[PDB]
Amino acid sequence: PPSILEIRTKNFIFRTKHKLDFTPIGCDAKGQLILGYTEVELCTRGSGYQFIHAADMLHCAESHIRMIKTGESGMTVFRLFAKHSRWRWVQSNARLIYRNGRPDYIIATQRPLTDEEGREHLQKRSTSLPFMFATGEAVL
Amino acid sequence: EVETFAFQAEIAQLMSLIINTFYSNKEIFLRELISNASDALDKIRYESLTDPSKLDSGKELKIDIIPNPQERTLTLVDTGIGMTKADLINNLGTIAKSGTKAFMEALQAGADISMIGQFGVGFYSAYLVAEKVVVITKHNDDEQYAWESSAGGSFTVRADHGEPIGRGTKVILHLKEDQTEYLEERRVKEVVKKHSQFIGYPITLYLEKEREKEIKKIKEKYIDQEELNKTKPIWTRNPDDITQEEYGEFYKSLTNDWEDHLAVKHFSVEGQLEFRALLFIPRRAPFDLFENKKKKNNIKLYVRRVFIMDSCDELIPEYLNFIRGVVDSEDLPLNISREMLQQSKILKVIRKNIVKKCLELFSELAEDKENYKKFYEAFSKNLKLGIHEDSTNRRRLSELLRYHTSQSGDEMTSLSEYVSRMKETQKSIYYITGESKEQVANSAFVERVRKRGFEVVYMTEPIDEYCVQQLKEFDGKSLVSVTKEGLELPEDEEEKKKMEESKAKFENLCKLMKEILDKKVEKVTISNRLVSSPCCIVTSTYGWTANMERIMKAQALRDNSTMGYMMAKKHLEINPDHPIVETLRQKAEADKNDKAVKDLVVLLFETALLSSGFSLEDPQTHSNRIYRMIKLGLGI
Amino acid sequence: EVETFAFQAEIAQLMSLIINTFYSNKEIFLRELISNASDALDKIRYESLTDPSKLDSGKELKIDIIPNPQERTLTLVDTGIGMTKADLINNLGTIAKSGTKAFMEALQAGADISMIGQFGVGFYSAYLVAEKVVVITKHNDDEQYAWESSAGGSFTVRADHGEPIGRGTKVILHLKEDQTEYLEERRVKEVVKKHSQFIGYPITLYLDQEELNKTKPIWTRNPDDITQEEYGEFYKSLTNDWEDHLAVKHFSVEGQLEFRALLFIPRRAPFDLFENKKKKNNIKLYVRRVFIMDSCDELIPEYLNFIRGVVDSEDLPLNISREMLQQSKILKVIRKNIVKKCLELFSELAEDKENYKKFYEAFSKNLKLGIHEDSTNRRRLSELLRYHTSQSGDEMTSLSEYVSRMKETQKSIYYITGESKEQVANSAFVERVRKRGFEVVYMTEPIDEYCVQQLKEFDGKSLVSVTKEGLELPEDEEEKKKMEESKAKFENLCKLMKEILDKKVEKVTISNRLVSSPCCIVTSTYGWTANMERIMKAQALRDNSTMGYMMAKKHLEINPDHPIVETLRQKAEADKNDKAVKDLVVLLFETALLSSGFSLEDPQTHSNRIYRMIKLGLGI
Amino acid sequence: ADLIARLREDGIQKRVIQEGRGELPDFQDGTKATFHFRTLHSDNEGSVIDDSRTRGKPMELIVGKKFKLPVWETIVCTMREGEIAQFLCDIKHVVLYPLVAKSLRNIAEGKDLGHADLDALQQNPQPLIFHIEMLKVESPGTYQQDPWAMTDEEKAKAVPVIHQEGNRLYREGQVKEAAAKYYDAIACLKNLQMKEQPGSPDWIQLDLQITPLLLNYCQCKLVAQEYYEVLDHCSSILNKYDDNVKAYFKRGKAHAAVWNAQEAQADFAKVLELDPALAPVVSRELRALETRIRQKDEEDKARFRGIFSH
Amino acid sequence: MQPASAKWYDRRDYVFIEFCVEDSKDVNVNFEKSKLTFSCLGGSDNFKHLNEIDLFHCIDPNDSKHKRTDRSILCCLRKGESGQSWPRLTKERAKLNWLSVDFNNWKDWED
Amino acid sequence: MQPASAKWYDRRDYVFIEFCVEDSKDVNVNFEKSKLTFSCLGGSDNFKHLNEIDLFHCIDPNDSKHKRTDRSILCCLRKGESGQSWPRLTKERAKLNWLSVDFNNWKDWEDDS
Ligand SMILES: Nc1ncnc2c1ncn2[C@@H]1O[C@H](COP(=O)(O)OP(=O)(O)O)[C@@H](O)[C@H]1O
Ligand SMILES: Nc1ncnc2c1ncn2[C@@H]1O[C@H](COP(=O)(O)OP(=O)(O)O)[C@@H](O)[C@H]1O
Ligand code: BEF
Ligand code: BEF
């Protein structure tokens, strides 16, 4: 009977609590350091605005529709804020919590990316949209 | 003649031993002081039960800690029994004597109180952080005194005339200049929460902030009534008097989880080793579950509501590492530091009971099929690992398994239901393993077994190859795999003549195949398991399963030398019903030396090798064969 | 008014503390008495250096043990310095009075004495196993005396008339009724070997005399005066192997944390390595030649588990039971120094360009596991790896030599990962690289992928795989337009087959590394390669939920020179939708996906397509 | 006098040369500006490095608030169709020159190199003389006004015009234009959709009115033979509207077009069990698929007899 | 007049109780079917000590015996029927606060 | 006359020496550029105590200070250069039997985290 002798890995998965409007109300331990932005400041204040960059907050909606029909938002990529004005990419799924009969809150599983990952995932991002002509490119 | 002496003690070096050798962490002085104050509170409460005249000077019971950042003093204030002059002299000025132990020896039997400490060396841990110490004390039998010392051989006891205390004790600690970190509040909160969270009395602290107050900005620095013991223990309550939300609240406090638990087990044991435990199964399996070799800290251990240790490895087996809870007791043999449990053979006895009660929790949860699926989809790998690890409780641990089968749709199904759904003639149970369900469903191996109307289990995870080296039987049933040599379907008595006839017909062709595929196979025999495909390849009876070879060729740290020892022993079988075999024998009989026959048999072997659970050597030649095929297909 | 009292302590509770809560093992009484006897011998030697007459009553400095099962009294004797009556009252009959510590502080200079006992408790451990303890002693300045107690508050001191001991001490232990296990010479020998092996004076055992601590410590001796045979004998007596040690390192560190370390590399790796998981005792820590603790994973990292040896010190803090260091920080320094010296032992062993192979063949897996784990020593372990290449033939060669063989325009180290050398040496991936005369690396072991995950660079040169995308080979201008024009005359077919697949390949381009094959499959720049994913999906403890977070895309590439793709392009031009085009493109994809190492899901699809082709071609 | 005063109060020095002809088209938000230009260096002997006739396509412009640098928007209002003069741009009005310069050179006609002049001029952002060749200014609302011109209320009512016009062209037999305009309607409805919170009721309402347009656009591709476009659009649609009928018929037809018989039959079963008693055409399709498969197999692919003739 | 401290444990056939008295004078210990009485006078302070405990199950007054050293008094009690596990020592389930199990030589003998 | 038992350790800037003399009377300490002297009447039996040390490097006598507590005399010394590492306290290499390292305050200030 051969044993199990595989070397364990150092994966960096971390979770956060999002409310029904996707806004957070807290983060767990590994998030306290990977993001570095301690519990209390995101729990009470959270800057008032979204922790998702605007160029990616439109891509949260497509995840949400799956999340509300079945429960899982699928594999999506955002851009969190960090304390040093940083930008830490994430690969993320979401699960919503049912109270009696009805939703209660949202907890999500996220994996960080080094910024090269984000650049390569973004260079393709800005072209894969079935919109109209950008002739005379004024604004997005 | 003989002369008799009494054992003595050198006080200076005994002090040095206490302050230098006993205690490794310097943050346990607060644990000891808090425990002392709690014991003093227990005494006054127990004496006030009989006649409340004793409780006429101060009704509340509380512990107060006052940092004094300017004056570098940490102060405890306690509203307990206090000590008189003689008590001060005999108790705090004599090492190894404790009045708590004498009290527990003195009271009438059957009293409902449990006070901490019987060593009598706990107080002197304060010098690990303090230069000199002041103990101002008030008791109901005499006036208010002040006990002064600096651990240097002597101490001074004086009458005090400050402001009244009413009743209780006040330990003032003048901190040494290198430990001035036990004044900021992060550290005191951390220490109190980690060590003395579940003391049975309120613990109060003073946070000197400034609030934005208005009725032109005024800075009003003030003293906050703060406290640090919001959560009570619940394992000290009747297991029936608790609702299912009190448990959830306590679990959320204990593990800092976000959702409530999935199942809570509350139990107590009686005997020489007595303890009461709560065990929580979390709904969602924790990420970073099988990586942390050091800080798993799943199960904590308490003694009389005082933290002892968290990361023992004989407390629980490593296949139950997701179970989180607390274990508390009354009479464990602590060591002089109250951080390690003497003679750790007790941990085996604790572990046995924890294991058996967790198995009982799994079985009880198995009745509510509405929520057992969520437990399986999070800890199936844990249960299979458990099957692979221990042998004593193998049976019931295997009984909890769920699998997909031949006709189960999208619903996992157990083994007992499979035995219920079994044909009356079935001698054995059929299983198959692979990377995905879709791969093993359309496997050529099981096509005839499925058509004849049999029901076959699907294992899909790599841990299943370890799970099937020990599942020899389930309810006295022989588990056999369709990918081996001797797949034994129920012998009908009508097809036996056909089988032997075709055996005679194709012995020649099997021998012809055996001599062209030299050392690529071990023998070419006749099949009884293919109905819709030409020849397939299977594995021997005492060798690694074709999928076990794939898994064993992935252990990074494994030794390579013994690879040819357990190496597979492949077998090629014959479909006598596909037109390939018919034309193959027809060409063979008229010519034993053709090129087309050799090329086609090599191609069939090398294309059925992929269909099984095997990996081609030198795949470029297979690709080149198909390349010459495509080229001739386009005519070049 | 003020009142000062003498700060006190009572004896009954203190003795109960010592007996009941200090020591968890009943076997360490022997460790305590043996240490006391060794100190008593050191005293009588030191007083004899500057006054030869002190040994006029006895000349040999030895220790005996006299187990006696006829009447359960274990006896321990020695020929040390002894005690006087005043010494008996003031040294034994006081809880925290250490005679040894008072002897130490009264040494006239920096003499050659290093004694063990300092706490003054520890002699009382004799009551862990004995009901009554007697001590018959004689000191050179007075008469032989007896001492008796039961640890019940009172002890007696009598003048003696028995058989004279001559000089020294005799501590006698009337063993408890339920502890008659320490009279068995198995138990005594096991305890002595574990705890008091390397003591500085001979220890015998009267059953018929026989000596226990035969082997002497060599880490104390100046390591410029040891011959390899002595090291070999010590290694054999330490590890029980009947082979010699391959290498040895014997250094020392001076300062606040002073210690001598002596390290060994066994000749052959143990067969139960990585698997035992029960005991990891390979570096034993000693303090003044008395065992303290085995390696509880703080002394040495896991990837150096094969190292064996000792660590000895003269000043380290110990808890009351003398079974554990008082500070975890000490172990960090010890670990740092021991790792730093091990990585120099390896480099010195690598200079012998022949004996190094017999070490690599044994512990390359451990070095690679270290490269995975140890993030601070990667730049030093990367120079201890040897790999097959496309030019070394049957020899394993370095990476520094690879840099010393790199062409004038070569800029990076090319590597491939597979499962057998004869297969990786002919794959479609390396055909063009072998054409331009470059050298690739055949890392063909499962741990190689883990190593490459972390390495990412070496000597200013960066590892680049041929199984990844966008491989850039230094190449001239003439091809620079051939490749561009080929991409310009293959847009149609590339897009058409990409959309025929449309779900299982992310993108389709023109290849850059094929000569004889028409197509192959490469993974994305990041995420798992083919082999890494093949290995990860077979772990049995892989977290199934987080596969997608570590997956990678696919890429199909086309060799424009191959006749089959040229004809296929010719066909697809005349008709954008021929069924032959779709069928044959799907067949090419399946064949290339099997060639590139991937596991092909639904293999019966491929098998049945081949089967049907055989059907029709054969004429059925 | 305010025109003349404001012209010369803002770093601009212009002399009236000749006035134009006709009424003023609206310069409001959404106004179109199609014109050429010529650029002259102020002091470098007027070296014409930038010029529209050297590239061959006239660059457009966005007059309203959508586009940036209101200096261009102001200067366009100064001239009119056929009216051309010299301009002289102030230093403060050329401060962010290279940022836009590189963007417009990249967005020139469009491919789907290196330029030292551009990065050198990036080092020195300097004003130039743009002798802009004005062609004409159009008026919003007075023609087939551009989809991005208005503020979603004109589109909200305009889209039915496009839908009806596309239907009329389709039934006449014009297919490419119908597909184009259905795409344009889908695009305007989509960037409408991307303004309001998902999970809102009007979100689902919008999706409901846009779905038939998406099916209509998917229709023409079947005549256009890009069956994979049909697959991509239908499979996207049906993840959430599980109960449509034509959203099944079209992708079934597409599947059956490219020899995907298995999924073709699988889809046809569902479309029948949502729309019973409508067999005839489905039978035609299924048996045409089977006969074409058999025909190809019997003649064209039986060529393989030689694969083992040796 | 006051009960003395005690530690205890058990084995396959024996129940061992140890009374933590020092310098005991003229101890008396009596054995019957279900009761054990222990009487001493310890220390120079001359404080009397008496312990009367009913037993959890019957023991053997013949095979049972006691030993006075100094540090304590040892009592050996052979069970009335061997193998019988004792979860406690007395009959009543209330916690006699002067008694505790001795874990320095405890043993889980029923493995 | 014998030297008093002493313990020592160091930080980045300061070297600490604690002379374990209980109930010290008439404590007198002397500081110099590379010299240290200590004397007291220790305990109640009135034995004398004198410790003489040749400092391993230069200290600042104006900045160093000694504060006596009831249990022991603690001295705090400033180094001549902020950051230099002291493997030992004396100039000579011979081990002294009245000096040992305070492992309950020792720390690696060189490799901070
Ligand atoms: N804060 C306090 N208030 C009142 N009495 C106390 C307090 N602290 C200690 N005592 C008494 O003084 C004695 C000091 O002993 P201690 O060092 O606490 O050892 P232990 O913790 O084993 O009791 C105790 O027996 C207790 O009865
Ligand atoms: N065999 C012996 N000969 C001489 N002295 C002894 C012997 N055994 C013990 N001692 C004395 O025991 C005294 C201290 O008791 P112990 O607990 O052994 O101290 P330590 O911690 O120093 O070992 C020391 O005086 C030492 O001299
Ligand atoms: F807090 Be004491 F040690 F019981
Ligand atoms: F042998 Be002693 F306890 F140092």
Side-chain angles (χ1 to χ4, degrees), chain B residues 36-37 40 43 78 81-83 91-92 97-100 116-124 169 171:
Chain B
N36 281 177
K43 263 194 290 305
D78 180 22
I81 183 65
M83 311 146 298
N91 287 346
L92 276 184
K97 181 201 285 286
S98 81
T100 299
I116 302 152
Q118 70 272 18
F119 293 150
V121 287
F123 180 75
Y124 308 117
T169 186
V171 176

mmCIF file of all heavy atoms in Angstrom, chain B residues 36-37 40 43 78 81-83 91-92 97-100 116-124 169 171, ligand 1:
data_model
loop_
_atom_site.group_PDB
_atom_site.id
_atom_site.type_symbol
_atom_site.label_atom_id
_atom_site.label_comp_id
_atom_site.label_asym_id
_atom_site.label_seq_id
_atom_site.Cartn_x
_atom_site.Cartn_y
_atom_site.Cartn_z
ATOM 1 N N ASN B 36 -5.852 34.590 40.379
ATOM 2 C CA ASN B 36 -5.897 34.872 41.810
ATOM 3 C C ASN B 36 -7.113 35.716 42.169
ATOM 4 O O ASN B 36 -7.812 35.442 43.154
ATOM 5 C CB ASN B 36 -4.614 35.586 42.235
ATOM 6 C CG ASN B 36 -3.455 34.641 42.405
ATOM 7 O OD1 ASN B 36 -2.337 35.059 42.696
ATOM 8 N ND2 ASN B 36 -3.712 33.355 42.217
ATOM 9 N N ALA B 37 -7.374 36.760 41.381
ATOM 10 C CA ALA B 37 -8.525 37.613 41.657
ATOM 11 C C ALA B 37 -9.827 36.836 41.533
ATOM 12 O O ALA B 37 -10.746 37.010 42.344
ATOM 13 C CB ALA B 37 -8.527 38.818 40.721
ATOM 14 N N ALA B 40 -10.286 34.782 44.637
ATOM 15 C CA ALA B 40 -10.729 35.628 45.739
ATOM 16 C C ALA B 40 -12.207 35.962 45.624
ATOM 17 O O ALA B 40 -12.912 36.017 46.637
ATOM 18 C CB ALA B 40 -9.896 36.908 45.786
ATOM 19 N N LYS B 43 -14.284 32.919 46.726
ATOM 20 C CA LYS B 43 -14.350 32.737 48.175
ATOM 21 C C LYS B 43 -15.422 33.623 48.805
ATOM 22 O O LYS B 43 -16.240 33.154 49.609
ATOM 23 C CB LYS B 43 -12.984 33.009 48.802
ATOM 24 C CG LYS B 43 -12.169 31.755 49.045
ATOM 25 C CD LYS B 43 -10.986 32.021 49.951
ATOM 26 C CE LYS B 43 -9.946 32.868 49.252
ATOM 27 N NZ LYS B 43 -9.528 32.262 47.963
ATOM 28 N N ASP B 78 -9.567 44.192 42.715
ATOM 29 C CA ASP B 78 -10.485 43.073 42.845
ATOM 30 C C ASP B 78 -11.353 43.295 44.072
ATOM 31 O O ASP B 78 -10.884 43.819 45.085
ATOM 32 C CB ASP B 78 -9.720 41.751 42.953
ATOM 33 C CG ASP B 78 -10.634 40.563 43.101
ATOM 34 O OD1 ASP B 78 -11.818 40.672 42.722
ATOM 35 O OD2 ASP B 78 -10.174 39.520 43.606
ATOM 36 N N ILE B 81 -12.485 38.512 48.629
ATOM 37 C CA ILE B 81 -12.473 38.332 50.075
ATOM 38 C C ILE B 81 -11.406 39.195 50.733
ATOM 39 O O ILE B 81 -11.619 39.729 51.827
ATOM 40 C CB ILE B 81 -12.295 36.839 50.411
ATOM 41 C CG1 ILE B 81 -12.351 36.616 51.918
ATOM 42 C CG2 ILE B 81 -11.006 36.297 49.825
ATOM 43 C CD1 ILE B 81 -13.688 36.939 52.520
ATOM 44 N N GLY B 82 -10.257 39.362 50.087
ATOM 45 C CA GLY B 82 -9.150 40.078 50.692
ATOM 46 C C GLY B 82 -8.397 39.213 51.692
ATOM 47 O O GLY B 82 -8.740 38.063 51.957
ATOM 48 N N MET B 83 -7.343 39.795 52.259
ATOM 49 C CA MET B 83 -6.519 39.112 53.244
ATOM 50 C C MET B 83 -6.268 40.022 54.435
ATOM 51 O O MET B 83 -6.091 41.232 54.277
ATOM 52 C CB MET B 83 -5.172 38.661 52.661
ATOM 53 C CG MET B 83 -5.249 37.919 51.342
ATOM 54 S SD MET B 83 -3.849 38.263 50.262
ATOM 55 C CE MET B 83 -4.036 40.017 49.991
ATOM 56 N N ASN B 91 0.482 34.063 53.666
ATOM 57 C CA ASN B 91 0.137 33.679 52.300
ATOM 58 C C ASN B 91 1.085 34.270 51.262
ATOM 59 O O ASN B 91 1.726 33.532 50.512
ATOM 60 C CB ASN B 91 -1.304 34.099 51.992
ATOM 61 C CG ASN B 91 -2.322 33.240 52.701
ATOM 62 O OD1 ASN B 91 -1.998 32.174 53.221
ATOM 63 N ND2 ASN B 91 -3.566 33.696 52.720
ATOM 64 N N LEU B 92 1.174 35.592 51.195
ATOM 65 C CA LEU B 92 1.963 36.253 50.168
ATOM 66 C C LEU B 92 3.436 36.367 50.527
ATOM 67 O O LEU B 92 4.232 36.788 49.684
ATOM 68 C CB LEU B 92 1.397 37.644 49.884
ATOM 69 C CG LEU B 92 0.243 37.686 48.885
ATOM 70 C CD1 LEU B 92 -0.173 39.116 48.596
ATOM 71 C CD2 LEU B 92 0.641 36.977 47.613
ATOM 72 N N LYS B 97 3.062 28.020 49.808
ATOM 73 C CA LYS B 97 1.845 27.937 50.601
ATOM 74 C C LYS B 97 0.741 28.714 49.903
ATOM 75 O O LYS B 97 0.921 29.891 49.572
ATOM 76 C CB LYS B 97 2.044 28.490 52.011
ATOM 77 C CG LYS B 97 0.784 28.393 52.858
ATOM 78 C CD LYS B 97 0.805 29.359 54.027
ATOM 79 C CE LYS B 97 1.734 28.891 55.126
ATOM 80 N NZ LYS B 97 1.152 27.753 55.883
ATOM 81 N N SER B 98 -0.394 28.058 49.680
ATOM 82 C CA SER B 98 -1.547 28.695 49.063
ATOM 83 C C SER B 98 -2.755 28.539 49.968
ATOM 84 O O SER B 98 -3.059 27.435 50.428
ATOM 85 C CB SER B 98 -1.848 28.100 47.689
ATOM 86 O OG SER B 98 -2.578 26.895 47.811
ATOM 87 N N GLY B 99 -3.443 29.654 50.224
ATOM 88 C CA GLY B 99 -4.658 29.599 51.015
ATOM 89 C C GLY B 99 -5.840 29.046 50.255
ATOM 90 O O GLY B 99 -6.795 28.556 50.863
ATOM 91 N N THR B 100 -5.797 29.117 48.925
ATOM 92 C CA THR B 100 -6.863 28.559 48.101
ATOM 93 C C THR B 100 -6.999 27.058 48.323
ATOM 94 O O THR B 100 -8.111 26.532 48.470
ATOM 95 C CB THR B 100 -6.576 28.868 46.632
ATOM 96 O OG1 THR B 100 -6.529 30.286 46.441
ATOM 97 C CG2 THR B 100 -7.627 28.264 45.728
ATOM 98 N N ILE B 116 -8.952 28.056 41.260
ATOM 99 C CA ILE B 116 -7.781 27.706 40.464
ATOM 100 C C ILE B 116 -6.527 27.807 41.317
ATOM 101 O O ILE B 116 -6.373 28.727 42.125
ATOM 102 C CB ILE B 116 -7.678 28.619 39.229
ATOM 103 C CG1 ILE B 116 -8.940 28.514 38.383
ATOM 104 C CG2 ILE B 116 -6.465 28.259 38.399
ATOM 105 C CD1 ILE B 116 -9.235 29.759 37.596
ATOM 106 N N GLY B 117 -5.622 26.853 41.139
ATOM 107 C CA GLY B 117 -4.305 26.964 41.726
ATOM 108 C C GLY B 117 -4.125 26.227 43.032
ATOM 109 O O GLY B 117 -4.893 26.418 43.977
ATOM 110 N N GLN B 118 -3.108 25.370 43.089
ATOM 111 C CA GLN B 118 -2.729 24.729 44.339
ATOM 112 C C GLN B 118 -1.218 24.662 44.511
ATOM 113 O O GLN B 118 -0.742 23.919 45.377
ATOM 114 C CB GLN B 118 -3.332 23.321 44.438
ATOM 115 C CG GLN B 118 -2.729 22.296 43.490
ATOM 116 C CD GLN B 118 -3.415 22.275 42.144
ATOM 117 O OE1 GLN B 118 -4.119 23.214 41.779
ATOM 118 N NE2 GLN B 118 -3.215 21.200 41.395
ATOM 119 N N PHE B 119 -0.450 25.412 43.723
ATOM 120 C CA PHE B 119 1.003 25.352 43.801
ATOM 121 C C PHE B 119 1.567 26.347 44.806
ATOM 122 O O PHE B 119 2.489 26.012 45.554
ATOM 123 C CB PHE B 119 1.616 25.604 42.422
ATOM 124 C CG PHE B 119 1.336 24.516 41.430
ATOM 125 C CD1 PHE B 119 1.235 24.801 40.083
ATOM 126 C CD2 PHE B 119 1.180 23.208 41.844
ATOM 127 C CE1 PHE B 119 0.981 23.804 39.172
ATOM 128 C CE2 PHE B 119 0.926 22.208 40.937
ATOM 129 C CZ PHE B 119 0.825 22.506 39.601
ATOM 130 N N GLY B 120 1.026 27.561 44.843
ATOM 131 C CA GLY B 120 1.501 28.559 45.777
ATOM 132 C C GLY B 120 2.704 29.347 45.318
ATOM 133 O O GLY B 120 3.379 29.968 46.142
ATOM 134 N N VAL B 121 3.008 29.318 44.023
ATOM 135 C CA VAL B 121 4.148 30.067 43.485
ATOM 136 C C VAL B 121 3.671 31.001 42.392
ATOM 137 O O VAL B 121 4.488 31.633 41.714
ATOM 138 C CB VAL B 121 5.212 29.126 42.884
ATOM 139 C CG1 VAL B 121 5.965 28.388 43.978
ATOM 140 C CG2 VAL B 121 4.573 28.138 41.919
ATOM 141 N N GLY B 122 2.358 31.118 42.228
ATOM 142 C CA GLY B 122 1.819 31.907 41.137
ATOM 143 C C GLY B 122 2.031 33.400 41.259
ATOM 144 O O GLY B 122 2.275 34.071 40.253
ATOM 145 N N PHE B 123 1.930 33.944 42.472
ATOM 146 C CA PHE B 123 2.002 35.393 42.636
ATOM 147 C C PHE B 123 3.364 35.935 42.225
ATOM 148 O O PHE B 123 3.454 36.983 41.575
ATOM 149 C CB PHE B 123 1.695 35.778 44.080
ATOM 150 C CG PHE B 123 1.759 37.250 44.334
ATOM 151 C CD1 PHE B 123 0.748 38.083 43.898
ATOM 152 C CD2 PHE B 123 2.831 37.804 45.005
ATOM 153 C CE1 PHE B 123 0.806 39.436 44.127
ATOM 154 C CE2 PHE B 123 2.892 39.157 45.238
ATOM 155 C CZ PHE B 123 1.881 39.974 44.799
ATOM 156 N N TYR B 124 4.437 35.230 42.586
ATOM 157 C CA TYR B 124 5.786 35.724 42.346
ATOM 158 C C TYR B 124 6.147 35.785 40.871
ATOM 159 O O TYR B 124 7.248 36.230 40.542
ATOM 160 C CB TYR B 124 6.794 34.858 43.095
ATOM 161 C CG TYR B 124 6.460 34.710 44.554
ATOM 162 C CD1 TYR B 124 6.162 33.472 45.091
ATOM 163 C CD2 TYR B 124 6.427 35.811 45.388
ATOM 164 C CE1 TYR B 124 5.848 33.335 46.420
ATOM 165 C CE2 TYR B 124 6.114 35.684 46.720
ATOM 166 C CZ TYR B 124 5.827 34.442 47.231
ATOM 167 O OH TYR B 124 5.514 34.302 48.561
ATOM 168 N N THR B 169 -8.760 43.615 47.126
ATOM 169 C CA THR B 169 -7.314 43.697 47.005
ATOM 170 C C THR B 169 -6.950 44.584 45.827
ATOM 171 O O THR B 169 -7.734 44.726 44.884
ATOM 172 C CB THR B 169 -6.701 42.309 46.823
ATOM 173 O OG1 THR B 169 -5.273 42.407 46.840
ATOM 174 C CG2 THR B 169 -7.152 41.708 45.513
ATOM 175 N N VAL B 171 -3.386 45.106 43.617
ATOM 176 C CA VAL B 171 -1.987 44.811 43.330
ATOM 177 C C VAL B 171 -1.466 45.863 42.362
ATOM 178 O O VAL B 171 -1.954 45.971 41.231
ATOM 179 C CB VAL B 171 -1.817 43.400 42.748
ATOM 180 C CG1 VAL B 171 -0.371 43.159 42.382
ATOM 181 C CG2 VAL B 171 -2.296 42.355 43.733
HETATM 182 N N1 LIG G 1 -5.724 39.041 44.722
HETATM 183 C C1 LIG G 1 -5.875 38.360 45.878
HETATM 184 N N2 LIG G 1 -6.842 38.652 46.770
HETATM 185 C C2 LIG G 1 -6.973 37.960 47.912
HETATM 186 N N3 LIG G 1 -6.179 36.936 48.261
HETATM 187 C C3 LIG G 1 -5.168 36.543 47.458
HETATM 188 C C4 LIG G 1 -4.961 37.253 46.194
HETATM 189 N N4 LIG G 1 -3.912 36.682 45.587
HETATM 190 C C5 LIG G 1 -3.481 35.688 46.392
HETATM 191 N N5 LIG G 1 -4.223 35.608 47.506
HETATM 192 C C6 LIG G 1 -4.003 34.623 48.580
HETATM 193 O O1 LIG G 1 -2.600 34.546 48.805
HETATM 194 C C7 LIG G 1 -2.062 33.292 48.393
HETATM 195 C C8 LIG G 1 -1.001 33.557 47.337
HETATM 196 O O2 LIG G 1 -0.677 32.345 46.671
HETATM 197 P P1 LIG G 1 -0.518 32.326 45.074
HETATM 198 O O3 LIG G 1 0.833 32.860 44.688
HETATM 199 O O4 LIG G 1 -1.766 32.933 44.494
HETATM 200 O O5 LIG G 1 -0.532 30.748 44.779
HETATM 201 P P2 LIG G 1 -1.861 30.027 44.251
HETATM 202 O O6 LIG G 1 -2.121 30.725 42.938
HETATM 203 O O7 LIG G 1 -1.478 28.573 44.135
HETATM 204 O O8 LIG G 1 -2.873 30.331 45.323
HETATM 205 C C9 LIG G 1 -3.207 32.467 47.840
HETATM 206 O O9 LIG G 1 -3.325 31.244 48.562
HETATM 207 C C10 LIG G 1 -4.460 33.277 48.064
HETATM 208 O O10 LIG G 1 -5.271 32.639 49.052
#
